[PDB]
């Protein structure tokens, strides 16, 4: 009966019905082509036989036919509902070009015949999911990281900042260091193994030098992990060396500022008055923020940077990775939002620019 | 026909503003100052690259008095803008650019040549900032009062054309306020420590000496970069504390006003009283400013009156009837009220003085970019683009003819 | 007082400063630049109105969301109008029709004259001057 | 004043949300959309006449 | 003060109706503008069924008609004892460019390569030239001094000091 909510990301795609508390289907966004097409997990196992491509890069779609196949797969196979029967809500990364919005609207209306649709910004959806009026959202997914300040739900485009450090880089760095300790990971299978290790084991250190000294002397920070072959490996100081790259990009070799510095700069860039609220309503989102202990380190860093009289308060819900989708799910179920839909007749009469007329 | 995929650029001494035509607010806004290292040189441009300290790095800007001087730096800035923020080939997008009212002909010609030959754009057009500011508010005729970082100027506009004769310039602008702030701090003996030097800070009682530690791992940096960081701190102080007195500055009345609280990066915090009012009074009465006894300087209100008085009489009712305020420096608290009081007092009663109400940051700073977007959106404007085929012959000949 | 105000009217000198003469004229039809200026005015108005609506709608949606969350907790125990009104019925006054601000239209014939901001000299001619 | 009509505001009533909505002005949007521009008054509370006998 | 924009929503009672109709495809297409002499092609969002139709804005390209003359005409009729041919040609070129907006023309007029002129002088010269040319062209079958006086009076009124304004106001009120 209700509408659909589809969220597209560089690493994972999430789809579900409005009003539900969690996405019904989650799968990786990859398209396999022969050396018919394959998508998601079916392509992953076939990837040994097939050639793989990614239709999204740094949150920006770069190939459209692949994206069309991704949407077709999502709807018909994962959701098993004909699109023309339901309204469809979509998500968009901040600072997205106009042409992308127009092409997306054209595809959605003409190819799939959806009766209505809307496009929303992921950061504001995360803010909705948190349930706050004014705040600053820190978003770090698989491909890209953004910091977006919001004032009464209106995202200030000029204060937004961007950073090209995300989970993919951290996984590659973990592979590099684990090879450097003496193991051997080359192909995509070992890359998935390393991603699993990163998700399972790594954590953020509150004080890097003290933890380094402890790992230098003590055995109390070591761990072991079991591989698919049944053989085991040992992992040590690497556990917190990898996530530390967030606050010290120099490790990866990039001359860029850390996430805390970027957030502080974004807050400072806005007007003087609203700074007080942003400090007290800082929000974290995305999969990359799921590392244990990140919130305390962030709070300590921003407390060091920020003026003494301000009050800093980090917010990190346990399910923050799906928070972006949860926000969209809440929004679609609202009553007042029903008047904000773009109808099919409006697209027919006006054209794709109608999206630039409504979806905000 | 109102939706041609065009881009519009706006560049100033403080920040560079770019975006897509038809949008309401500029998409990207980053500072104009960039870092340069010799041994062609290497440029670090955006905010993230600029903050990181490094050895032998100097701070430079391509603009001088509102005109381009360092063409290599300008080309690097445009390259960074395109590649990182736009992420689209320049050959596909028509471009619109703003220019200072007094920009000379040869520099316009060289800019057009650079764009067409190097960036290979499909179409081009140039306009002056005053006209675009007038368009943003929807006025064909009006007086534009602009107070940026470098100059405070008054430009009259009639039927969408700039009247060259009436332009009046003054040097009292944001940089003058920054110099005044530096003088104040030197008088108070407050040491300025830029954030990059601080490793950590402790809380200290009001007025007491600061307590902080230095980052030992810092490689030595140059003079200009350190000075630029100090200027950033002082700019923040300007934005936070200063205020303009409603009437003429009076020490006794100011002394009775409540104070304000500020905290520096190194943890030092002290309360400011009459000093936060005495400084901005310079913009309205430069004569009494210490160290600048030269009375030949003109205040903002006197600048406006002189600029209007130099135009044709029949147009003066039109100019006084629509006065537009623009520029970042006008954002100082209580500036518009003092300007309105002065103008209403000094203007002859026979003329109906009016000030356009636009007192918000986004539209007060980005007015020129908004006007450019509006102009690019117009359907009938599509006739006026300069094309590559037109660039071949009339690129030099018709550029003089095309954009008056 | 009458001799002194006849002195004063010979003072300020109707021959000196008080009341003024007529303006001349020459007709001329509109041109491309005038149409561009009108379209610019219309577009600027549209831009401003859109942005302002934009802010208001965002605020309203945020307030609705926060109140929805509050209602969820407690359970533990104006911006649009219909299509028909937009494109039908003319809001006639009775005892005429309300205007509508449309973008400029191309001239069907050479009849639209260019006007300007003379303002001070009130428009439309003077029928009966003195026998010059 | 200039006294132009296209810049005038006047009282109006909608049909679906049937009520007097204060001073309003009609205008044409970007693509084809027809919009109503609403002004402000300090008597907005009392303007709910309807049916004007 | 807000503004309501038209919408076809607020409910989903329209499950029908919308489910029986299909949209007309759109296209991103190039177009030719007759107003452009170079023939350059720009791209366009438009309904795919109306390809090739001329640009509907080209009907706004209307120019102001300004006369022209040859050497022989300037030899016979337009010769003047206070204007060189080059100066008049400059005046007429400026008039064509700026569409007889004489204030703008006076602003942009080259006052150093040619002796300074007031706007009234420009108007007078232009009207004399055009009138004589039209008169000759007709098959068998302006007042500068007044404007100058008006502008001088306006200038005198403008520089009136406030005490004079108050004195005039007092005298006026005495007459009721
Ligand atoms: N603790 C963790 N739990 C889950 N995923 C984690 C964790 N730490 C890092 N990750 C990485 O986070 C990524 C998942 O992030 P997410 O699902 O938010 O991405 P996305 O939606 O594709 O991003 P984007 O929209 O920014 O392109 C995966 O690469 C996963 O390896
Ligand atoms: N919020 C603020 N309050 C007070 N002053 C401000 C504020 N924001 C900016 N300024 C002042 O305005 C200056 C920037 O002005 P603006 O944005 O108009 O520059 P610009 O147009 O790039 O300059 P220019 O035309 O001289 O090249 C800042 O350097 C500072 O001096």
Author numbering:
A (entry chain J): 5 to 39, 51 to 375
B (entry chain L): 8 to 46, 65 to 429
C (entry chain G): 780 to 856, 2220 to 2237, 2243 to 2279
D (entry chain H): 432 to 484
E (entry chain I): 70 to 210, 218 to 252
Paper text:
Following the unresolved N-terminal domain of EP400 and preceding its motor domain, the pre-HSA region and a portion of HSA interact with DMAP1, ACTB, and one BAF53a subunit, collectively forming the ARP module. In the TIP60 complex, the ARP module plays a central role connecting to all other structural and functional modules, in contrast to its peripheral location in the yeast NuA4 and SWR1 complexes. Within the ARP module, the HSA of EP400 functions as a “pillar” that is surrounded by BAF53a, ACTB, DMAP1, and EPC1 (right), leaving the other half of HSA exposed to the solvent. The PMD of EP400 folds back toward the N terminus, integrating itself into the ARP module and contributing to the surface that tethers the HAT module to the rest of the complex. Of the 48 amino acids of EPC1 visible in our structure (amino acid 432 to 479), a short segment (amino acid 457 to 464) interacts with a negatively charged cavity created by EP400 and DMAP1 through four positively charged residues that form salt bridges and hydrogen bonds with the cavity. The pre-HSA helix of EP400 plays an important role within the core of the ARP module, where it is sandwiched between DMAP1 and the PMD of EP400 (right). Specifically, R807 and H811 in the pre-HSA interact with D168 and K131 in DMAP1, respectively, whereas R807 and K809 of the pre-HSA interact with Y2261 and with D2259 and I2260 of the PMD, respectively. Notably, the R807 residue of the pre-HSA, which participates in interactions with both DMAP1 and the PMD, has been identified as a cancer-associated mutation (R807H). Additionally, D162 and R170 in the SANT domain of DMAP1 form salt bridges and hydrogen-bond interactions with R426 and D184 of BAF53a, respectively.
The human Tat-interactive protein, 60 kDa (TIP60) complex, a fusion of the yeast nucleosome acetyltransferase of histone H4 (NuA4) and switch/sucrose nonfermentable related 1 (SWR1) complexes, is involved in both histone acetylation and H2A.Z-H2B histone exchange and is essential for cell viability, playing a role, among other cellular processes, in gene regulation and DNA double-strand break repair. TIP60 can modify nucleosomes through covalent and noncovalent mechanisms by using its histone acetyltransferase (HAT) module and its E1A binding protein P400 (EP400) chromatin remodeler subunit, respectively. TIP60 consists of five modules, including TINTIN, HAT, TRRAP, ARP, and BASE, each with distinct functions. Within the complex, the EP400 protein functions as a major scaffold, making interactions with all the functional and structural modules, a role similar to that of the Eaf1 subunit in the yeast NuA4 complex and of the Swr1 subunit in the SWR1 complex, the two subunits of which EP400 is a merge.
